[PDB]
Design a protein around this motif. Sequence first.
Motif, PDB file in Angstrom:
ATOM      1  N   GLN C 362       0.709  -1.250  -0.112  1.00  0.00           N
ATOM      2  CA  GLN C 362      -0.076   0.139  -0.133  1.00  0.00           C
ATOM      3  C   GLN C 362       0.671   1.349   0.103  1.00  0.00           C
ATOM      4  O   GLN C 362       0.407   2.208  -0.693  1.00  0.00           O
ATOM      5  CB  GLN C 362      -0.890   0.282   1.182  1.00  0.00           C
ATOM      6  N   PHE C 365       1.687   2.540  -3.384  1.00  0.00           N
ATOM      7  CA  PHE C 365       0.515   3.004  -3.880  1.00  0.00           C
ATOM      8  C   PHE C 365      -0.114   4.051  -3.759  1.00  0.00           C
ATOM      9  O   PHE C 365      -0.190   5.196  -4.731  1.00  0.00           O
ATOM     10  CB  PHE C 365      -0.781   2.148  -3.888  1.00  0.00           C
ATOM     11  N   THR C 366       0.004   4.709  -2.429  1.00  0.00           N
ATOM     12  CA  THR C 366      -0.714   5.755  -2.005  1.00  0.00           C
ATOM     13  C   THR C 366       0.261   6.742  -1.007  1.00  0.00           C
ATOM     14  O   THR C 366      -0.233   7.897  -0.371  1.00  0.00           O
ATOM     15  CB  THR C 366      -1.923   5.618  -1.032  1.00  0.00           C
ATOM     16  N   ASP C 367       1.397   6.399  -0.712  1.00  0.00           N
ATOM     17  CA  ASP C 367       2.041   6.976   0.425  1.00  0.00           C
ATOM     18  C   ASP C 367       3.640   7.091   0.046  1.00  0.00           C
ATOM     19  O   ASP C 367       4.687   7.039   0.733  1.00  0.00           O
ATOM     20  CB  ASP C 367       2.027   6.228   1.733  1.00  0.00           C
ATOM     21  N   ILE C 431      11.748   5.668  13.864  1.00  0.00           N
ATOM     22  CA  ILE C 431      12.021   4.409  14.521  1.00  0.00           C
ATOM     23  C   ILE C 431      10.958   3.340  14.251  1.00  0.00           C
ATOM     24  O   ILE C 431       9.767   3.514  14.218  1.00  0.00           O
ATOM     25  CB  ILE C 431      12.864   4.331  15.929  1.00  0.00           C
ATOM     26  N   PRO C 433       9.476   0.294  16.354  1.00  0.00           N
ATOM     27  CA  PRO C 433       9.778  -0.025  17.788  1.00  0.00           C
ATOM     28  C   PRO C 433       9.646  -1.618  17.895  1.00  0.00           C
ATOM     29  O   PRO C 433       9.224  -2.413  17.362  1.00  0.00           O
ATOM     30  CB  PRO C 433       8.435   0.676  18.656  1.00  0.00           C
ATOM     31  N   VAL C 637       5.345  -4.453   9.407  1.00  0.00           N
ATOM     32  CA  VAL C 637       5.862  -4.012  10.347  1.00  0.00           C
ATOM     33  C   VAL C 637       5.438  -2.960  10.757  1.00  0.00           C
ATOM     34  O   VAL C 637       5.809  -1.937  10.590  1.00  0.00           O
ATOM     35  CB  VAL C 637       7.446  -4.127  10.581  1.00  0.00           C
ATOM     36  N   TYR C 638       4.293  -2.836  11.837  1.00  0.00           N
ATOM     37  CA  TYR C 638       3.383  -1.544  11.840  1.00  0.00           C
ATOM     38  C   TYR C 638       4.231  -0.706  12.832  1.00  0.00           C
ATOM     39  O   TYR C 638       4.778  -1.218  14.336  1.00  0.00           O
ATOM     40  CB  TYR C 638       2.157  -1.823  12.623  1.00  0.00           C
ATOM     41  N   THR C 639       4.108   0.429  12.566  1.00  0.00           N
ATOM     42  CA  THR C 639       4.822   1.630  13.556  1.00  0.00           C
ATOM     43  C   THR C 639       3.289   2.243  14.342  1.00  0.00           C
ATOM     44  O   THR C 639       2.397   2.137  13.965  1.00  0.00           O
ATOM     45  CB  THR C 639       5.573   2.620  12.857  1.00  0.00           C
ATOM     46  N   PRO C 640       3.863   2.889  15.409  1.00  0.00           N
ATOM     47  CA  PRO C 640       2.838   3.578  16.053  1.00  0.00           C
ATOM     48  C   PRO C 640       2.295   4.765  15.030  1.00  0.00           C
ATOM     49  O   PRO C 640       1.037   4.875  15.217  1.00  0.00           O
ATOM     50  CB  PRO C 640       3.579   4.314  17.324  1.00  0.00           C
ATOM     51  N   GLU C 641       2.840   5.199  14.108  1.00  0.00           N
ATOM     52  CA  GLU C 641       2.064   5.963  13.046  1.00  0.00           C
ATOM     53  C   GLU C 641       1.768   5.082  12.013  1.00  0.00           C
ATOM     54  O   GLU C 641       2.305   4.131  11.737  1.00  0.00           O
ATOM     55  CB  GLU C 641       3.335   6.913  12.389  1.00  0.00           C
ATOM     56  N   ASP C 642       0.410   5.130  11.656  1.00  0.00           N
ATOM     57  CA  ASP C 642      -0.108   4.463  10.728  1.00  0.00           C
ATOM     58  C   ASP C 642       0.463   4.097   9.365  1.00  0.00           C
ATOM     59  O   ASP C 642       0.755   3.107   8.669  1.00  0.00           O
ATOM     60  CB  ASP C 642      -1.731   4.582  10.515  1.00  0.00           C
ATOM     61  N   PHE C 643       0.992   5.267   8.804  1.00  0.00           N
ATOM     62  CA  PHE C 643       1.435   5.565   7.500  1.00  0.00           C
ATOM     63  C   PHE C 643       2.877   6.384   7.213  1.00  0.00           C
ATOM     64  O   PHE C 643       2.941   7.152   8.003  1.00  0.00           O
ATOM     65  CB  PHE C 643       0.317   6.312   6.455  1.00  0.00           C
TER      66      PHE C 643
END
Lengths: 68, 120, 768, 136, 63
Positions: C362, C365-367, C431, C433, C637-643
Amino acid sequence: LLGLREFRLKQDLQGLNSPNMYQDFGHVIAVDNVTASIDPNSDAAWLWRSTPGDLTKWMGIPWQSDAA
Amino acid sequence: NLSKNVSKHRLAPAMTAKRRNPNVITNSLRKQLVISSQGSVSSDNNTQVPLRGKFPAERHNVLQGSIECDNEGVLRFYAGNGISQALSPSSLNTDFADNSNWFDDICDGRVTAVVELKNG
Amino acid sequence: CQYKIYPPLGIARVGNGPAIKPLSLSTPEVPWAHLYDTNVQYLVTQQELEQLLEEAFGGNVINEISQIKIETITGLLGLSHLVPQQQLSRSLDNLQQIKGALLKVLSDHYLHAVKKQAQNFYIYKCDNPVEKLKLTDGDKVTWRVEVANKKSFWYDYNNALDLSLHTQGSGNLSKNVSKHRLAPAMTAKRRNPNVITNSLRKQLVISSQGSVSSDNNTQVPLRGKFPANERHNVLQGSIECDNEGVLRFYAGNGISQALSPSSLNTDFADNSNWFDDICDGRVTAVVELKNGDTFEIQDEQSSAWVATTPPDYAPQIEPIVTMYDMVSGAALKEQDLDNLTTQFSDVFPILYRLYRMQWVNQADFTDNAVNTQIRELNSELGFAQLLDNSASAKSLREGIFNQFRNPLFDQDIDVDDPGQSSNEWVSNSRIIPSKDETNIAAKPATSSLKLPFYPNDGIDYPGSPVQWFAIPPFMYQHLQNWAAGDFSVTQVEKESANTIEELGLFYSEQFKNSPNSALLCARGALDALYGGGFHPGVELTWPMRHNLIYSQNDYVSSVTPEINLLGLREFRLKQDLQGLNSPNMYQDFGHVIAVDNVTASIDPNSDAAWLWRSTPGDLTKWMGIPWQSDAASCQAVYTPEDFPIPSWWAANLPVHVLPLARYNKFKDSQSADLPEINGMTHSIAQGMSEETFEHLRLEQFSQRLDWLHTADLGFVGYHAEGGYTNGLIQMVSQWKNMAMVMARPVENPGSSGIPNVVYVAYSQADKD
Amino acid sequence: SCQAVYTPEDFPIPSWWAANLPVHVLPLARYNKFKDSQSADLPEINGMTHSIAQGMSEETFEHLRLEQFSQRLDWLHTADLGFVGYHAEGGYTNGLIQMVSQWKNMAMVMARPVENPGSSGIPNVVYVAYSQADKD
Amino acid sequence: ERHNVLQGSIECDNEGVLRFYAGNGISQALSPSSLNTDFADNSNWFDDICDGRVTAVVELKNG
Ligand SMILES: [Mg+2]
Ligand SMILES: [Mg+2]
Ligand code: NA
């Protein structure tokens, strides 16, 4: 009866104000860091010269996990 | 205490170790992870003094111990109440040794004194 | 040196489709050959099975149908090597009626199956490979393969050991990583640590071998056992030779298993009690001519290697940095990168691959501002500005270059505690986490996150610049030369560069017509494999980025006289000439492996040099066991920021895909002669305005689905748990049902903004 | 526990009580990538530089707006419900546990204006999900 | 797909005594990842416990 000894810990005489109060070795610690600390002139020799907290910092956090 | 055989023949190799609470970055901010306190007591007053720090340094008060001196000059050092806690209730201490987000009231530190005699 | 095998490192991918040519795929022999091929079928289709049944009838099968007009019938169509005999007979037993009945049993076993990607190996005659060996009456070639799997025998994969290796720097890894301790190598313990002594640990290694010649095309299985001598048969691969002498190597069926059913594979890479059917090993041959001349192809300059790997779930989507790029970078010294010469064709692959990641990720595509700028340039037929090396285009090139992360890893950092043992390079960008959270305020990032948005070798270390992927030093040098204007490009390239797609098609034509088939085949085997991050990766891992693993690694030529396209190389793996009988087949370093062992291995005369002289199983032993665990851990790998959402290896294990269900809701134009148009009734579809019709198309086009949700990975059902660990466990059986991405046409996009070629992910779950 | 209930078939995704505990939402980050029109006098337009946003064709510009408008995010990911971080477990139960602290950080849906949708197909009033995690 | 389940074994001696043996104690799930974590109700599991009906017919020499 295994004898009586006079012993003293190495102490950083500045204690809580020591410039090595918050020392570490970066992202990991490893035996190489302890090897380097053997040399009293090295940037790792602080490992042996205790500031407050240095004796117990190795132990499990919290201690009750280690006990169980 | 330890035979050279253990290292020489690689019988139990030392592992690398990562940081606890690794999400706190820079030495400046990692200072918040250290709990510290200090106190003084003398033979002229046997009032007990708490050794109380903060974690991180909500913020929680951490009683690291207590000190008192009797009129004979003997220092009595008490440790803390055995209170361990996490910053969030859902952080469980599932590891024997390495649990992030946890603090306990264990401590260790430097003990010094000054003797002042009546003749100066 | 008269004959050589190509490719020098062949690649075959597991799949549950059958090991037969019509229903399998072949590893790329020419790079970029089919990137827009909208006819591809990477899953076994109904038509392929119908067609396979036609060939099993034909001439004198209709004769015999009228003769016994039942074991007569089933013996006369050689299908028992595909489906066991029982079901074939019971199919007819129970009730042209023959075809439908036989088709149903083949469909049960193979419809929608992940086709195997098999490697073709060729003998080339040398003057330097001039032409493929051409057999004449009386000539024969005999091929020999010996393969092994040592994952269960080898060490835990914690991180790449070379992150702490003292180096002067290569094209692939800056000396800064080790020099400034950016991501220290960890010690690693043994897998299956309860089986002690080297003799008993030999049981942890699966191995097999086989031979085939051009005199008989019968396929030969490479079958081992685990544990080796309840034991389990492990099919590591299959080999066959055709009458022209070309060897075709098929990987296993993708079967991973534990010795006990209750042993779950809950770790991304290190699971005791598990085996899988991945393997790698030595490929040799003997050429025997009419006259009695015999030519052994056995030495490391002329023989070859094979490695098997997980499936490629988006074969037309290339990793931004490939395993071939690692080969090319391994030959270079970091300190000499200022002597590199740059053409535009050396930087286009970076822009083209990142642009095509939109189909699997994604964020791309959009970021991704670079992809959005490429789209802007395309929309005005202005892509050719990027090929302009003059001062008037410099700010345009620099603006793109400056968004890319520098593999020196010395940007977007503050030097923490200079001069102390706590000296540290700490990122001031975003970073990633650890999952072990600390409820203390994050430090606000002051530097924008650089491209690409993927994790990397150093992921374990929050705040290390090496948590995030950088194109390697030599490729960054190309991009930097491009930004500076120090690059060349031809006018005929400029003429084909109005859009990125037009230039990509042009470059594909240059590969296709390059006359060095041998070198193209060596590169093609590796250009679809990942070249980072290595944690451990997908197919192979970090030893491949060191020149030490090659016995030869030479630049040979540009792809065409005037177009380099990153070049063609002659390379060969270092090989232990004894293969499975090597005295070092079962070597290890004791209770742990550590970077000290790798340091000791650099000297080819030392006791540890064996680390680089490959015996069967040495390329794949580093990878996750089972591989499905690593695949299910190879996602976001998800960050506290979504995108943007970070993704690991999305070109080969997609993360966000365009499902078939969505394709079927945008492929049609409003005038389609269909009772249902884009999921609407004909009347509703044609009653709405054209503007709204095209908007609905683009909305459906824009719906991207988590690839983990394209089969049941443990999140299906009321109060299902979902989560990371169930994905790992469920991937062992579900890997074969995951969505497979395939280019598909949109015949008339109109003004909807949907390209004429889209990349659609097929699975049973996502189909409607 | 008031979210999607996934079936073996991917679509449609069933949802429990989505009008009050949303399941797929349009985050602020996306709003800020379609709320602007191409002629806006801003150094950044829909998250693009002024130069890129105005150099593209009007048709492409409106397409990019609709693409962003169409990106809907699991409401469970609008705060850290146990899936953030390297090898984070995520999953249903951690969601349950983390909501006790994270409910106050979940995305809140609010009607917001699009001043000139032009030909993009985006309505003049959109409903946008605000949280700290999803804001850019 | 599908597993054979030995529910028991039977034999009769020449005196007419029937001897009934149970199964081998083999329990299994249809998928290895289905773990039997509940004391009593685990879906996807079979075991080889059984029960049922025992009948006989006696035939004498005189018919
Ligand atoms: Mg791919
Ligand atoms: Mg509501
Ligand atoms: Na110019």
